[PDB]
Structure formats: C-alpha cells, structure tokens
Design a protein around this ligand. Structure first.
Ligand SMILES: O=C(O)c1ccc(-c2nn(C(=O)c3c(Cl)cccc3C(F)(F)F)c3cc(Cl)ccc23)c(OCc2ccccc2)c1
Ligand SMILES: O=C(O)c1ccc(-c2nn(C(=O)c3c(Cl)cccc3C(F)(F)F)c3cc(Cl)ccc23)c(OCc2ccccc2)c1
Lengths: 261, 259
C-alpha cells in the first residue's frame, strides 16, 4: 500500500468512527478533566437522585447492585449495534462472506467494548449517558457480593490502556484491526480477512508514527495490549457464569432476557 | 538506536541463542524433513515402540511420559535462564525483577521453542534422537491425552510464520523483557530494554522476510496465543495435582507456577 492510501484509509475510518459513536474520546476527556458538569453518582442517595432528575435509561426499570450490573449489560448491547454499523464502513468488510461477518462481530465486540470503555474512564470513575453522568470507581467497587469485584478489573485495564494516550484517530484503526481478526473460531474464508487486517495494520503503524513520533515502538505496545484484551474478556466470561449460577434475583422479562442475552 | 546498532544486537542475541540452546530449529527441521541417513529419529507411536525406544535411545506409561516432559522442561528453564543473562541490561536489573521476569516468561518461551521441534504429526525428543507421534500423545488416558494436543495446535499455526533461529532469538528476548509482569518493581528500565529489542526484531524481520508483509505485527499477535496456552496448562496441572496425589513436580517448576 502506498503511504497516501494508508492516510486515506486512516481518514476514512476516523470520519466513520465519529459518526458511529456518540461520545468520542476527545469529548469524554474534556468532561473528565473538567476543561455543564456531569451529574455525579458516588453513593446510594446520589444514585437515587440521578435516576429521578436525569433519566438514565439503563438504570431505571430491586437491589441496587443488580440494577447497576444489568445497566452495564443494557449499555453493552447498545454499543454492539454501534460497533456493527462502524464495521460496515471498513473497506472490504461488507464484501466478506455473510457468516464470517457475523462471526467477526460476535467474537470481537467484547474486546472492542472494553477498549472503548477506557475512553470513558479514568482512575476515579466512568462517564455514563453520553457523558451527562459520572459514576465513581469507589461506588462501583463497593457494590456487594461479586458485583463489586466484577467492576474493578475494568478500571484496572482502562488505567493501563489510557497510559498509551491514544486519540480517536488512533483508536478508529485499532478497533478496525480487532474486528478483522482471522483467528476467530468458525471462520469460513480467512484469507480476505487477514488481507484486510494487513492493510489496517499498515495504516495503524503509519498513523502512530505520524501522530506520536516521540512515542517509540507505540505500535508494538498497542499490539501487546491485544493480549490484555483477550485475557480480560476470558476472565469476564468466567465471572458472568459465576454470577448466573449463584444469583436468584437476576430475572428480567423473558423478552428482555432474549434481547440482552 | 541506529540501524547498525540494531544489527549488532541481533547478531549478539543469535550468537548467545546458539550457545545456550543445544537443539536449534535449523537442526530440528533437518531431522524432521529427513532426506538424511545419519540423523533419522526412532519413532514412538505405541506401547511397543516406546519399550523398544527406551533400549535404542517402572510405572504407568502416561505417568512416565508426563514425567519425561517435566524433566525436560526443567532443563529448558535452565537453558532459558542462561540465555536471559546474555540479554544486554538483564543482569543489571533489580534482582527481584530478574526472578519475576523469568517466573512468568519461561513457559511462554518453552511453548515457542517447543514448536521448533513439532510438525503436524509429532514432536522430537531426546535431543532429536526420538520422535513421538501426536496421535500417541493424544491417546494417553485420564487428563494426560488432552494435555498434549493444545501444544501441537499452537505450533502448527506458529510454524506457518516460518521463523528461523535468528528471528526466534530476538523474539524470545522480547518475551522475557515484558514490563507488564505482575509484581515488577521498576517497569521503566525493563521497557527501555524491550524497546531496543522490539526495534531490533522489527528490523530483523524486514531484512530476513522482506516479502512477509506485517510479519512483525503478526508475530506479536502470537504472544496472545502463548499467554492463553500457559493459562490452560496451569489449570491442567491443578487437576493432575488433585487427582494424582503420589506425583511430584521438580522444585524449580513448582516455584515457577506458585501464583
Ligand atoms: O457507553 C459505553 O460505550 C459503555 C460501554 C460499556 C459499558 C460497560 N460495560 N461493562 C461490562 O461489564 C461489560 C464490558 Cl466492559 C464488556 C462487555 C460486556 C459487559 C457487560 F455486558 F457485562 F456489561 C462495564 C463495567 C464497568 Cl465497571 C463500567 C462500564 C461498563 C458502559 O457502562 C455504562 C454504565 C455504567 C454503569 C451503569 C450503567 C451503565 C458504557
Ligand atoms: O526439548 C525441549 O526443549 C522440550 C521442552 C518442553 C517439553 C514438554 N513439556 N511438556 C509439558 O507438559 C510441560 C511444559 Cl510444555 C512446560 C512445563 C512443564 C511441563 C510438564 F511438567 F507438564 F511436563 C510437553 C508436552 C508436550 Cl505434548 C510435548 C512436549 C512437552 C519437551 O518435551 C519433550 C518430551 C516429550 C515426551 C517425553 C519426553 C520428552 C521438550
């Protein structure tokens, strides 16, 4: 690929990433650093007021720890549709076999949700409802039973990931790289997937050298984070199963259970 | 680092890798592909060929084989430790960090270098004098059968990269100098060394595999496969520990897996 084509691919992905995702990293950092302050949820009473004054669609209709956990699950489903739409803009993606498109999205969304959640996090908490709200790390970590220990690993990853100081133009290509992973189980035609990922990796490499020229070997270090992502996604799955087999108070309307399966 | 300094570091690391590891990938491939009469391995594919293999190269066969693997893993830890001492900057690090880097790194390197000894049909043993088939290992009883197969699965994919020893020497160094190991005290001096090693690996792969597009990225993505298999392995050991109460591990290995 020629250098100018890689920059074209990078710019294409950045524009689509801006249209697909409501709250960008650039805007999220402005809210987090305090540079219209978000409503802060730091305890039980502040949560109760936030749902009454603001309409947090994922924290309304039970026990608080379960409602918060389910709220994270409800937002994760919304993000899946945003990731799906963004994937359609990746050159070559919609031309892949239809089952392979579904397979790539099925096994990639968790890694991408974790990646993009870091954009909304700092060491003290996480933005919610398109940056209108802020839930503290301490409030999430203090939820009872396994729900508290379910939340903290996300902040631990995000803090490490955010030290790379990626911006949105870096992240748009990186997320594209994750989607086009040829090692997903059940892929039928790996070759066009790895061919697209090779273009995306070239575009990411050049993007990082031009956008972070003093950040030595940032490309390599970002690729090493794909290990952290896979590891934490597998831990995540094992934490859910434990919650599922233990907790008798998790029942939603069956139609809801289907949607948010 | 300048280009000539990166080439110097690659040659340094390849030199130490030859001095540290008795069975290289180059020699392993010459034995496996055959076409020679002086380095043909004896092939162990069932009980009878195993029994004859012991004369040519106590307890239940699956246990004896597992013990064979653990004994060679200990030797591998010894060879890996010796190579690590040669990586510029490693011995100058805080001593607790040296232990920590080796604790979490040796297994990822064992799996990497075990692939050199593998093809889809089996694995070289006893310094390449023997060859134990994949089917025979898979057919062991209890948990031991499924204990063997995940290694072959990784190797088939890893070997498709067609790395040679000079490539692997730098890659193995990159793995050891990982700043994200749990419990490290001084992450910065470790990451500075890894940066030079990553630069050296990058230049090495471009010169040695110029048609292999993005091989650098693809090789780094393999560190994900490595991390996963080490995790599966540790969980398989635990099942064996609670099932086989009369089976001991080497002290060096038991220290490595604790936490
Ligand atoms: O806006 C967005 O892009 C957004 C994106 C993600 C969350 C998110 N999800 N997540 C999870 O566990 C989770 C993750 Cl990482 C991956 C897959 C599935 C899950 C699932 F399914 F298990 F949920 C959180 C855990 C923590 Cl600690 C904090 C946030 C999340 C998100 O949370 C907003 C939120 C926070 C609190 C209460 C209600 C909503 C927002
Ligand atoms: O030459 C070398 O560098 C070499 C290096 C490794 C083995 C190795 N070990 N290993 C294990 O399980 C194992 C591993 Cl990976 C790490 C730590 C502890 C263990 C323990 F404790 F579980 F054993 C194998 C499983 C399979 Cl399937 C194939 C190979 C290994 C190796 O095996 C050669 C061999 C095979 C059969 C009989 C005798 C020797 C060689």
């Amino acid at each position: 690929m020629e250098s100018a084509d890689l920059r074209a691919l990078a710019k294409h992905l950045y524009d689509s990433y801006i249209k697909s995702f409501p709250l960008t990293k650039a805007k999220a950092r402005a809210i987090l650093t305090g540079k219209k302050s978000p409503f802060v949820i730091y305890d039980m009473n502040s949560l109760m007021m936030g749902e009454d004054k603001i309409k947090f669609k994922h924290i309304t209709p039970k026990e608080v720890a379960i409602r918060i956990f389910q709220g994270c699950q409800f937002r994760s489903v919304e993000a899946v549709q945003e990731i799906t739409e963004y994937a359609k803009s990746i050159p070559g993606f919609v031309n892949l076999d239809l089952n392979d498109q579904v397979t790539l999205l099925k096994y990639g969304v968790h890694e991408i949700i974790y990646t993009m959640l870091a954009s909304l996090m700092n060491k003290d908490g996480v933005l919610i409802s398109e940056g209108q709200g802020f839930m503290t790390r301490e409030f999430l970590k203090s939820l009872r039973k396994p729900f508290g220990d379910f939340m903290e690993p996300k902040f631990e990853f995000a803090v490490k990931f955010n030290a790379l100081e990626l911006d949105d133009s870096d992240l748009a290509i990186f997320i594209a790289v994750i989607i086009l992973s040829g090692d997903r189980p059940g892929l039928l035609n790996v070759k066009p997937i790895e061919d697209i990922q090779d273009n995306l990796l070239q575009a990411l490499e050049l993007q990082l050298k031009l956008n972070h020229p003093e950040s030595s070997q940032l490309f390599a270090k970002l690729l090493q984070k794909m290990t952290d992502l896979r590891q934490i996604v597998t831990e995540h799955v094992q934490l859910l199963q434990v919650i599922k087999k233990t907790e008798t108070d998790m029942s939603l309307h069956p139609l809801l259970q289907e949607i948010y399966k």
